[PDB]
Each structure stands twice: as structure tokens, then as C-alpha cells.
């Protein structure tokens, strides 16, 4: 049944993203791999993160990846090169959402940050839930987030 | 900027889904709540699962929810009533993917199951991975799965 053969990682798969004919996979050792789904070949080994990558988003040749060390990176699928620099969080990334040119990230300390992928500038910043963000949904300038304390919050982004 | 205020759940949020102006939330106690983004009111308390809900998919008025007891449920957003029956998995649901009228579910035993939401029929039933399925991507009849042993597989369906 297997369409192609992928080598996988030397550690647990923690994040997955799929756009056009390219698969991006992240693992608990910080590694990120880019695969061609038409041939099964490994396109490139990304620089990865210094920590387990916890979230991936992949849209229009642009990948956003987050790690347990709080880093959020925005890079070009074709080269793995960083397009822009984000400050990230001082806590592990627990949720990522990517819609239009906006990245929303959630962290274990409850903070939620809104980034512009064009410039990397922090558009919106707050402490959010003050409880680990467990789920993020971002659609049509509306962010819906959930936390470990049971709260569900809705933010308009504009 | 903060649109509405939602009561939330009495336990930790484990899954979120958002379609049109409706939010579906699932919690560690098995409860599933349906919210109206506009008014901010609680639309209904779904029957939920007898286990912690681990995954949520919400698309075209149809919600697919999975739980740690291995149950996958397909129900209508407006009423909460189950439309069809899925026999589910024998271990915990760990990943859900919903594209067109197909649901792909991955479990802690590594099994990957493919369901038709119109009939509830099990379309495909792979052994999948030798470890827990940790990620699923489903697009254009192509399934990409990842597992805790580091494997990544691509399935045509």
C-alpha cells in the first residue's frame, strides 16, 4: 500500500506537515527532514532546532517550526534558509497556527504571540491563558486557543 | 481584541476545532462542548466519550472525535446526533485526519484505519507502524503518518 519509502528519523516523529508534493517531518532530537513524495527521496536535512520540534506548519513554500526550547523559525522549503527571525517564547512551543502571512504560536507558560512572517515583527503579545496552550485554531483573523486549566479563549486579530 | 468569553471545561482542553463561527472543544474528562463564536453562548453539551477525547476534526457541519478508549464518532454539529457508526480502534486514538468524505484514524497500537463517513464502512485497515502513530496528514487521497519509532510512511488510497 505504501506509495513511497521514507527513511524516517533517528528519534520519535513529533510533527508532520504536507503541502503540494513535499512532506516535512520533525523529530524529538530536533531534526527536520524534507521529502519528495513523488520519489521518496530526502530533499534536505534542515538545520533543525536545538531541541525537540513540537509543531510544524507548511503553506505556500513557507514552513514554520517550533521547538521545546521556545524557538519559532520561518524558512523556505526549497533551501531550508531562514526567511525571517522571530524572538519566540521563554517556554516550550505547544501549538502553532499559520494563516495568510500571520503565525500564531502558543507556549507551555500560556503566552500567545502573533507574528508577521514578512518582517518577523511581533504584532500581538500577551500572557494568554497562564496555562499551557494545548490547542490552537486560526482562521479568518480569529484565534481560538485551549489550555490545561480548561479555558477556551477567542481573539480577533487585526 | 478578545472577541467572546467561554466558560470552558472543568478539565484540561485536549482538542480544538473551528469551522464557520462554531468552536468545538474536547477535554480530558471526555466532555465535548459546542460554542457559538458570535454570541459566545454554549450551544450544547455533546454526549462526549467515556474516555479523554484526544482528537477533533470539524468540517462541513460534520465533527469527528476520537478518544483514549479507541472510539471514533461522526456526528452533526447542529444536533450532536451521530450520523454513522465506526467500530474504531482497540487502543487509544492518537491522530485524526478528515478530507472530503474520508476519515483517517491512527492509534497507540500503530494501526491506521480509513473510514467512509457516508456509510461508516472500514475502507482500508493497515497494520501501519510498530509503535504509536503520532501524526497524520491527509490530502488528495494521500496519507502521511509518523510514529514514535521514527518511521514516516506514505499511503495511496
Author numbering:
A (entry chain A): 2 to 159
B (entry chain B): 2 to 158
From the publication, what sentences describe this entry?
WD40 proteins are a subfamily of propeller proteins with no intrinsic enzymatic activity, but their stable, modular architecture and versatile surface have allowed evolution to adapt them to many vital roles. By computationally reverse-engineering the duplication, fusion and diversification events in the evolutionary history of a WD40 protein, a perfectly symmetrical homologue called Tako8 was made. A different computational approach was employed to redesign Tako8 to create Ika8, a fourfold-symmetrical protein in which neighbouring blades carry compensating charges. Tako and Ika are the first successfully designed eight-bladed WD40-repeat proteins for which structures have been confirmed crystallographically.
In contrast to Tako, Ika expressed well as a polypeptide with two, four or eight blades. Ika2 and Ika4, carrying two or four blades per subunit, respectively, were found to assemble spontaneously into a complete eight-bladed ring in solution. Ika8 produced two crystal forms in space group P63, with one or three copies in the asymmetric unit. Ika4, however, crystallized in space group P212121. In one crystal form of Ika8 this axis is crystallographic, but in the other (and in the Ika4 crystals) it is noncrystallographic. In all crystal forms, the Ika proteins assemble as trimers which stack on top of each other into pillars. Unlike in the Tako8 protein, the conserved inter­actions stabilizing the crystal assembly involve hydrogen bonds between the outer rims of neighbouring molecules, while the interactions at the top face are mediated by water molecules and are not conserved. In comparison, only the alternating repeats of the Ika proteins can be superposed, in contrast to the template structure where the overlap of the individual blades is much poorer. The melting/denaturation curves show that the Ika proteins are more stable than Tako8, especially under low-salt conditions.
